[PDB]
């Protein structure tokens, strides 16, 4: 006999959830004036 295969669609997460590194302190981003590179976006692991 034989059958169909189960279907799996495989597409990118909603609002592209996870594509950018949010909530991960290691790979956090930055947004600072071109001088004084002091970060201005400091993320944590609790604010999800």
């Amino acid at each position: 006999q034989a059958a169909p295969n189960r279907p799996n669609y495989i597409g990118f997460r909603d609002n592209f959830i996870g594509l950018m590194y949010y909530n991960s302190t290691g790979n956090m981003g930055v947004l600072a004036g071109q001088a004084s590179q002091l970060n201005a976006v400091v993320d944590l692991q609790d604010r999800n």
Partner: protein, 52 residues
Amino acid sequence: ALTSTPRSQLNPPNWPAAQVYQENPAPTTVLLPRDAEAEVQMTNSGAQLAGG
């Protein structure tokens, strides 16, 4: 006789500290960006100051 400091010997071997061109620069006024007292108080309060 109008551009040479009256010397006692041509090619004197140690020009003293007065007849040689000292360079005075204007005092370097720096704008200390921050007051540490207030920053420490705020960071103790729980804030997490971060930025330029």
